[PDB]
Amino acid sequence: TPYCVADYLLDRLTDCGADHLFGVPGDYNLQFLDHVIDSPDICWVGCANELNASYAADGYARCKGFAALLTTFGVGELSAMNGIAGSYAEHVPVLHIVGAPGTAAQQRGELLHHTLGDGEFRHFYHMSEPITVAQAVLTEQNACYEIDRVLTTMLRERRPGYLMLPADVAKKAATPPVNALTHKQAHADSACLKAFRDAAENKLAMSKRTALLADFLVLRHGLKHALQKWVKEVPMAHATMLMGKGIFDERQAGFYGTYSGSASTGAVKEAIEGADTVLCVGTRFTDTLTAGFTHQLTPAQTIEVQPHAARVGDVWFTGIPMNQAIETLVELCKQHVHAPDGSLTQENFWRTLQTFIRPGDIILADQGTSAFGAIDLRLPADVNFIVQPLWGSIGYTLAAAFGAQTACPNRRVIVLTGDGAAQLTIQELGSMLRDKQHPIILVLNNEGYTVERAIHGAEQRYNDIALWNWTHIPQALSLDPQSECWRVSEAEQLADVLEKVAHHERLSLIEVMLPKADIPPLLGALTKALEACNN
Amino acid sequence: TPYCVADYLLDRLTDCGADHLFGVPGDYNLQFLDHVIDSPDICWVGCANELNASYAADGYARCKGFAALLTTFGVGELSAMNGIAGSYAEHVPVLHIVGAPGTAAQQRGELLHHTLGDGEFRHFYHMSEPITVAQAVLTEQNACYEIDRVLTTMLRERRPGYLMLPADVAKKAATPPVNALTHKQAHADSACLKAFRDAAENKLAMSKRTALLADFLVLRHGLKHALQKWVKEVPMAHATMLMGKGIFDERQAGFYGTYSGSASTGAVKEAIEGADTVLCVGTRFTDTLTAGFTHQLTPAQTIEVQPHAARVGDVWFTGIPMNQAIETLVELCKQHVHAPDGSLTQENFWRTLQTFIRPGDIILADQGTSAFGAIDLRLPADVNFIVQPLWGSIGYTLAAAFGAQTACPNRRVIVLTGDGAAQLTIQELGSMLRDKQHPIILVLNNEGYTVERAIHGAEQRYNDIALWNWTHIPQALSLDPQSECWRVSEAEQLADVLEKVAHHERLSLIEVMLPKADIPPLLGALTKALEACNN
Amino acid sequence: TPYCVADYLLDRLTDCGADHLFGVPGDYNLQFLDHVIDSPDICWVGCANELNASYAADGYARCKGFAALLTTFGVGELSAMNGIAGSYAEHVPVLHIVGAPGTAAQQRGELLHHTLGDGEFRHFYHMSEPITVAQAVLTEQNACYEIDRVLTTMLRERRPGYLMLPADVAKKAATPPVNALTHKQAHADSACLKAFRDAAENKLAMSKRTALLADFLVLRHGLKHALQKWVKEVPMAHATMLMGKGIFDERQAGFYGTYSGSASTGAVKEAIEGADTVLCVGTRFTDTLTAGFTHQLTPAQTIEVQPHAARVGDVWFTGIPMNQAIETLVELCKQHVHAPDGSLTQENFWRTLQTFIRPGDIILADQGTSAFGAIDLRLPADVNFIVQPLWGSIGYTLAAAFGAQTACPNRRVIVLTGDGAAQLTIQELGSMLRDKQHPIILVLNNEGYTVERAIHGAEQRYNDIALWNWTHIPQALSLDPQSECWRVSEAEQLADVLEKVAHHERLSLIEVMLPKADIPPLLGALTKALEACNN
Ligand SMILES: Cc1ncc(C[n+]2csc(CCOP(=O)(O)OP(=O)(O)O)c2C)c(N)n1
């Protein structure tokens, strides 16, 4: 078992923060798989299909900051396309490793299985270029430094990477790295940082009131603590949008709720849009997050910081690391200080869930009523809120949850998913069972896609779905389900079963019966804007 | 004239070693052009067409290690494609800057001139991806760090880079860099270098005789001195192939001539192929350099070092910088010490030229009899030999020469070009005149493409060319040609004209009449192999 | 000499209307070249470089409706990129044939010359995809039907096509086609044509006055006669823009001059923009043709016909061939009837040229004062006016002229080119000489790029050019120039010389001395708009 490229790769995975590898075996990656099984630092996690695997890796990365996925040439990698795309869209560092035929076989252009039958082997590699920030075809001559390059680029941009690993290359000899792959992000040019500082100061110096608006990018770049500390030391109005929900303890002073354009509550709208200068940190104003771009923030009124550039008014200062810009803003901000029960409905359902969430929780909500209902949950401290509003691929959360549980075995995972969504990735529930995870899964059963009904064709057949018997799924995907299932239809029951599971001694699945047309407050707004675009 | 992106870019150009900018103006780059003219560090050099400009930049980069080209969107950039491609093929760091329409206009998808008329503005950018190692579309939010990224990647890989500079972005405010862009190439993993060292030692330790074979990559990575020093301290048989010709003083001990497979002389073939261990440094065995892949070197018999990886036998050690690998090899080597006149013809022409070349010369030879004749020149010290065997685009050398003169005003530039080749880039001779350069240009007039004739269809009309009156060209491309012209046909004539022009007090153009079918020794071999491929 | 793929290809070329093949030889296309030389239907035309060749083919196709270009892998094809792009931008059917290495050698991924040195052979093929409507890599199994498919697609869309011809494939056996490749463009769906007809009628039925505006697409689709006949039978105000100049006899009734937005004369602006319904046929409103999009034409006021779709008001009728739409419009229209100097200057130069042009002339004008001055020429009948306003690549017209002469040996070719422009493709003048063509070439010598000066930096060094001795160029690019040359500075001299060369018994080159800042009327407008975009 001499040390080889396969081992080098795994070592770099661990250096990056990954302790598991998701994926599904395939002819071309079996031998590589031996190495991951023999590795004492990487644990193999086989999934039901590669789409789920990619979702799982995404979830995992949202917990540990990095993840890896292993698929097989063609059939495996293409099945994961939507997953990687989502990771790229929401800045989630997922490494995609694809086992491929030997270099010699590829040169020969043979009619190998898992190919288009044309002797071409770079089709899928090129198809993956738009959804990765770095990729490479590993060869006997570039193996190690290419591996280090993509991984390094991944950590810098916080996005997916792609590595084609030909089976023979995996076996090639290599020597263990003396040093772990370093992150060490470069500092900003002092002069540029100064220019930014001066511009920011002049702006904040004349500001009557200042507000802070932060989103997902701060989560991706590990600046949560920086922001919590900031708002604690310098009290001010502060919020996040759906994507960044979870960076703040929403029970603290200065938090009036989650911001989402004109669809926000009057308090939030006032606290944020009302300030004469608002700091936008790691912010991305997508249509879903702003209720159709109805946010009232102007260039003059704002200061925004992005991963590698910051802006004050109309001027941009490129070449400034997000962390340094935030640091500068904190210093300046200290320099200008200023003074019931019954039948279940979306309404009472979210109200009940509110009294249930506890610190240290990991909550995932899928597209639809789940996500736009959960947006109103007032989160305690140390809770990881996982949602995917920009990419918005339904089915994601159930699989993502499996990934989160794998990353945090000792944290309570709450999965909020619609009945339509859960159908797309149901088989991963079988993986939760196999690995004996204890997540508390709530399926909002409203007999279909109510968000779609809300947008158009409420009574159209295409918004219906096969009606499943949810509570019986666990015993179908397992020979001995360490699970507990319930069908709830009354607020009381829901609250009842919630306390019975609040300590997750087993996988618990709760089928929550809800009205077909019942829609959360926010959702109505977003829904009316979407159909307005269709007309 | 506030400091802006345009200025930031130029400053980085100078940091990289460029003092000139080649190109041809265009609507979209005029404003940017102002900045280069006002810059005290960058000199603008307008050319006759973009193709020539790109060739000139390549030649310039082969002298100063870096160059920049400026063209206009669409019509300008595509005209330079072949040049950039050649730079990429032969590892020449040329930065291609293309002035483009404003970002707003591009978003609007307007029917602007220099477009395909479809509202798309990324076609040409994408078309340039295969021939650059890094590229970027500059925006108001990424300007500076993207500019530094491509330039940095260029210096690392020694290859072309591409920057699309929208006119409005050029005008955006920026702040001067406090520090010059650093190269600082990373060191190899001590463990990997060790493994390479041990493997190399075991191999060298049992070697009866060792030989050194170096090529162009050592020139590109600035290791010319390292190799000269090496061979001086550790005497051994050593050579280069056509591409790397010039790294060694071929008058020194251990040099028996240029290596080119079985087409080499018996002495060279024995000195190199005869050693039981041959060191291949920065080597690339192309068909033209090996006479149809007729080199007799085996894996076991060799040790090769590439830019980022080295090999001994069948084992590769990836992640080792070329300079460190050479350093290691030098240490280990010291541990194993082991003791004309008459009618002109290709024959007497090259013999004459041999007595003419002097140290400090810069010699350029185009594809055809020029290049395969010049390969036998025994070069003195400090001479820059410029040839392009891998890409092999005829016309290149005349324009490249202009670039070389621009970079080395005080060095004697000898241009060896065929009559067919000179026709493709003739107008750049007008630039030489305008800038009052004093090249000594020799046009081998054999009435056509004799190399092609040698390959196939010797008496075919397609190998003929319009017959020009070469000695009258200067007075056609200038109102006051600071030049001297000669039509030579006897070795004595050539001999005398060369003594006259020895100190290049003026541009001198020598039309050398040669036989239509006269071919140099080496060329016959290469020629027979090429047609063998056609059958 | 058994019939092979090479022969099949040539036969298809002739079927398409080509009698010549432009290009420059190369190792990989020599054997194919034998076939073209032996062909009694295709004449080989070797050029100075492949950029010029592609321009020549473009010009040729503008005369015969189809052309072919032959280059060599990598170095050849990339040099022609700008030409093919221009052809694609302006809808010129040029077939680009590139000779390539044998299929076996390509599969092997060898380090062949003219490659990037990575074993990849599809880079350039892919790079050419955005500028062609069809392309194919010829193989032993697809040769003939792929050849027919791209050619057919070319004829349909009137755009460039690409064929990679591996040397070995060219030698493969084939059988001569029984039938010539048919065009036979499909008819429109009767119901769709009816809907278009009814909509057009309702519009025309209430029109007080109707005007016709036609451009280059009618030229490309061979509908010149259809339009001339139209306007003759149904008298009405009619014009073309710069690109379509030449479709009409501008001396006839109803023609008030060339249309170009607000930069047009009051008469033209009134005749066209003044009608309540204007027919836009084969029209493309680019920025250069409309003086910065200053045309005053509204959707309700217009009816436009494109190659495969027509529009009336806001409704589009897709699936209607241009020729049928025109036919329908003609029928409906018939249903609604209604009631000297001394010192030379741009002014007196164009006035003089006006009295010189005669029916049957072929006039080419390059970008700059040439094109924007020639736009005011009142053209007689049967004159082919060649200009390239959309792509706008300078240097194009000199080479294109060579192509036009080749296609029309017995027509008088007038080349109007600036001194800046002619420098980029000057060597093709050598080809005109070699083939003994009798162009009458006028070089507007105003010491530089006056259009650029008019746009920005009038006194900037970057708008200057090497000053050439134009009248001495022919005797430099030929050993026996069958030509006459004159430097002209007075209007008297211009008229005189023009009378001497009227019957083009020889190549005649006229250097026309003009003021550095002298700009034509129209150009001032276009110039002010371009710099407005830079700010
Ligand atoms: C992969 C994928 N396919 C289709 C869609 C379109 N879509 C968005 S929401 C939705 C339905 C949501 O159904 P569900 O989970 O039932 O939500 P609820 O009725 O709870 O709102 C669909 C089909 C999507 N986002 N992703």
Ligand SMILES: Cc1ncc(C[n+]2csc(CCOP(=O)(O)OP(=O)(O)O)c2C)c(N)n1
């Ligand atoms: C741009 C380009 N076009 C075509 C070729 C194919 N080619 C290789 S050598 C050659 C002719 C060389 O002519 P010349 O300079 O006359 O040389 P000689 O007769 O001295 O061998 C040609 C056309 C090429 N290398 N590059």
Ligand SMILES: Cc1ncc(C[n+]2csc(CCOP(=O)(O)OP(=O)(O)O)c2C)c(N)n1
């Ligand atoms: C290949 C190419 N390079 C650069 C340009 C930008 N350009 C447009 S017009 C022009 C100068 C025109 O010079 P010239 O032929 O002298 O005309 P005049 O002075 O008659 O206007 C230039 C450089 C272009 N259109 N095409």
Ligand SMILES: [Mg+2]
């Ligand atoms: Mg549902």
Ligand SMILES: [Mg+2]
């Ligand atoms: Mg020659």
Ligand SMILES: [Mg+2]
């Ligand atoms: Mg001019």
